[PDB]
Amino acid sequence: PPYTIVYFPVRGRCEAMRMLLADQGQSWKEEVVTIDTWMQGLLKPTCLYGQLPKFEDGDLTLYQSNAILRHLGRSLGLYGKNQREAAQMDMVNDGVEDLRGKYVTLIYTNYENGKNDYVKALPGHLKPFETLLSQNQGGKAFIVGDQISFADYNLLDLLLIHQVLAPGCLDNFPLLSAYVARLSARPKIKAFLSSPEHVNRPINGNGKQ
Amino acid sequence: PPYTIVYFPVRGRCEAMRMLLADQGQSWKEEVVTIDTWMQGLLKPTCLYGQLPKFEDGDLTLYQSNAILRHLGRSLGLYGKNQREAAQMDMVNDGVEDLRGKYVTLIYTNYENGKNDYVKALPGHLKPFETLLSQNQGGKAFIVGDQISFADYNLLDLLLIHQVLAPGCLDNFPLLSAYVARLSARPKIKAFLSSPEHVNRPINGNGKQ
Numbered sequence: 159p160p161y162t163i164v165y166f167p168v169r170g171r172c173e174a175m176r177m178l179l180a181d182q183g184q185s186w187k188e189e190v191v192t193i194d195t196w197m198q199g200l201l202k203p204t205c206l207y208g209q210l211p212k213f214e215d216g217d218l219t220l221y222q223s224n225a226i227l228r229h230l231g232r233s234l235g236l237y238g239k240n241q242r243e244a245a246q247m248d249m250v251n252d253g254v255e256d257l258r259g260k261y262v263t264l265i266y267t268n269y270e271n272g273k274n275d276y277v278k279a280l281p282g283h284l285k286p287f288e289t290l291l292s293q294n295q296g297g298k299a300f301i302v303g304d305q306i307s308f309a310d311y312n313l314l315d316l317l318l319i320h321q322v323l324a325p326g327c328l329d330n331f332p333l334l335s336a337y338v339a340r341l342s343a344r345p346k347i348k349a350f351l352s353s354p355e356h357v358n359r360p361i362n363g364n365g366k367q
Numbered sequence: 368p369p370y371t372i373v374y375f376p377v378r379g380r381c382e383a384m385r386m387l388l389a390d391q392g393q394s395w396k397e398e399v400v401t402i403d404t405w406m407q408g409l410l411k412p413t414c415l416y417g418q419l420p421k422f423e424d425g426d427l428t429l430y431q432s433n434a435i436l437r438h439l440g441r442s443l444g445l446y447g448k449n450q451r452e453a454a455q456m457d458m459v460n461d462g463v464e465d466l467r468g469k470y471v472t473l474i475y476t477n478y479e480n481g482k483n484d485y486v487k488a489l490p491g492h493l494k495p496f497e498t499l500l501s502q503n504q505g506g507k508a509f510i511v512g513d514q515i516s517f518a519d520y521n522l523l524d525l526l527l528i529h530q531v532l533a534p535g536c537l538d539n540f541p542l543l544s545a546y547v548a549r550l551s552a553r554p555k556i557k558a559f560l561s562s563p564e565h566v567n568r569p570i571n572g573n574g575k576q
């Protein structure tokens with residue numbers, strides 16, 4: 159510590175890490191970058207890959223949202239109890255990222271023309287997570303093992319934004335539906351999800367959701 | 368162990384993990400899935416995300432090429448020496464993956480019309496790695512720290528396929544070009560790169576490179 163998130167004024171690729179920090183009782187500073195500031199081209203060339211988020215943990219500076227999540231998972235004990243679980247958590251998180259990338263492409267480049275196709279294909283992309291839950295204590299714990307991990311926070315965020323895109327998309331995924339309800343009721347997450355800083359933040363930068 | 372790689376008959380997303388295994392003196396089985404077999408639709412529904420590679424390590428079955436890389440990195444001691452290095456290796460590997468995804472899209476969907484633009488944009492995407500090398504012992508060690516890591520095997524593979532796609536792409540990146548030469552000279556890597564199994568395997572599945 160201390161922690162600083164440097165990002166556009168959206169939920170996007172930072173809401174999962176924010177929920178993680180909140181659920182761990184951690185404070186952090188937000189440095190909000192506006193689009194007009196970004197277009198001036200001062201900050202962008204100083205970012206490793208030209209993009210946000212940028213994240214500071216003490217004198218450690220990171221880019222890449224999933225590297226930040228993994229770092230928080232490693233440093234706060236949210237990465238499983240052994241190597242087998244850590245590998246499975248990575249396999250989950252990579253699957254979350256694959257679907258998130260498709261979501262972002264829909265939202266930002268093809269919303270009107272692509273949404274129907276996307277929603278029709280969505281059950282096939284959610285089923286793997288239902289299956290994973292079914293095989294871990296019949297789905298009554300977390301996505302891997304019996305302790306929450308960085309992958310849970312990312313998966314939870316992914317599921318929540320998809321419930322906005324496609325209400326009832328979890329109607330046929332009972333384990334995922336109960337998992338979302340359960341994690342959402344964790345007191346520090348419930349408080350985060352009703353906090354003004356989260357509620358007033360749009361999901362994406364173009365207002366579509 | 369023992370290790371099995373289940374994958375299409377290409378280098379693709381498995382040549383980095385193959386190099387890693389070869390360099391660490393490990394043996395593995397290749398279960399090659401032809402296009403004809405894959406299109407029979409028997410194996411695909413049993414894969415977690417409907418895709419390959421699939422990886423078996425004793426009784427652990429994994430998917431997701433980067434999760435497999437991280438699992439081999441964790442279990443074989445190729446993940447740095449502290450939390451700081453591990454986070455930086457993740458930030459590197461996520462950048463490698465971002466470019467790999469763009470490479471795959473070019474190869475399989477848009478080679479003829481997209482190649483000129485892709486090659487024009489390539490230096491901008493390789494520069495971050497030259498910069499990281501320039502800040503870690505003037506490029507004479509590895510991408511993070513002074514021990515080879517899973518991120519090195521992935522970055523090496525990314526650079527090698529880009530040298531075939533765009534000869535001379537490292538001409539203005541002397542650290543990256545020296546790094547490719549040095550790591551390719553590691554005796555077990557050089558032997559793997561000379562082996563008929565690798566030499567006869569096409570980079571991609573569509574005859575383009």
Ligand SMILES: N[C@@H](CCC(=O)N[C@@H](CSCc1ccc([N+](=O)[O-])cc1)C(=O)NCC(=O)O)C(=O)O
Nearest residue numbers: 166167168170171193208209210211222223224363
């Ligand atoms: N692989 C990276 C991907 C990061 C990424 O896509 N960053 C986008 C922001 S998230 C998506 C996004 C885009 C725009 C806004 N906005 O408010 O205008 C918000 C969010 C970015 O920096 N874009 C600016 C650029 O490339 O110059 C990661 O996981 O962190």
Ligand SMILES: N[C@@H](CCC(=O)N[C@@H](CSCc1ccc([N+](=O)[O-])cc1)C(=O)NCC(=O)O)C(=O)O
Nearest residue numbers: 256375376377379402417418419420431432433572
């Ligand atoms: N995020 C995943 C991405 C895996 C992926 O793209 N898998 C591709 C194979 S790699 C690219 C590829 C495509 C085709 C061949 N080929 O020889 O026919 C080889 C490699 C796949 O399974 N495609 C089949 C499908 O989706 O049904 C990862 O990192 O492992």
Ligand SMILES: [Ca+2]
Nearest residue numbers: 169170171262
């Ligand atoms: Ca985003």
Ligand SMILES: [Ca+2]
Nearest residue numbers: 263264268272
């Ligand atoms: Ca789309």
Ligand SMILES: [Ca+2]
Nearest residue numbers: 378379380471
């Ligand atoms: Ca591939």
Ligand SMILES: [Ca+2]
Nearest residue numbers: 413414415416
């Ligand atoms: Ca499976």
Ligand SMILES: [Cl-]
Nearest residue numbers: 299340341344
């Ligand atoms: Cl819970």
Ligand code: NA
Nearest residue numbers: 167168190359
């Ligand atoms: Na905001």
Ligand code: NA
Nearest residue numbers: 170171258262
């Ligand atoms: Na997002």
Ligand code: NA
Nearest residue numbers: 171172173174
């Ligand atoms: Na997020």
Ligand code: NA
Nearest residue numbers: 224225255461
């Ligand atoms: Na990632």
Ligand code: NA
Nearest residue numbers: 253254256257
């Ligand atoms: Na996925």
Ligand code: NA
Nearest residue numbers: 443444445514
């Ligand atoms: Na080592």
Ligand code: NA
Nearest residue numbers: 255259461465
């Ligand atoms: Na990404």
Ligand code: NA
Nearest residue numbers: 418471472475
């Ligand atoms: Na593909």
Ligand code: NA
Nearest residue numbers: 472473477481
């Ligand atoms: Na392209």
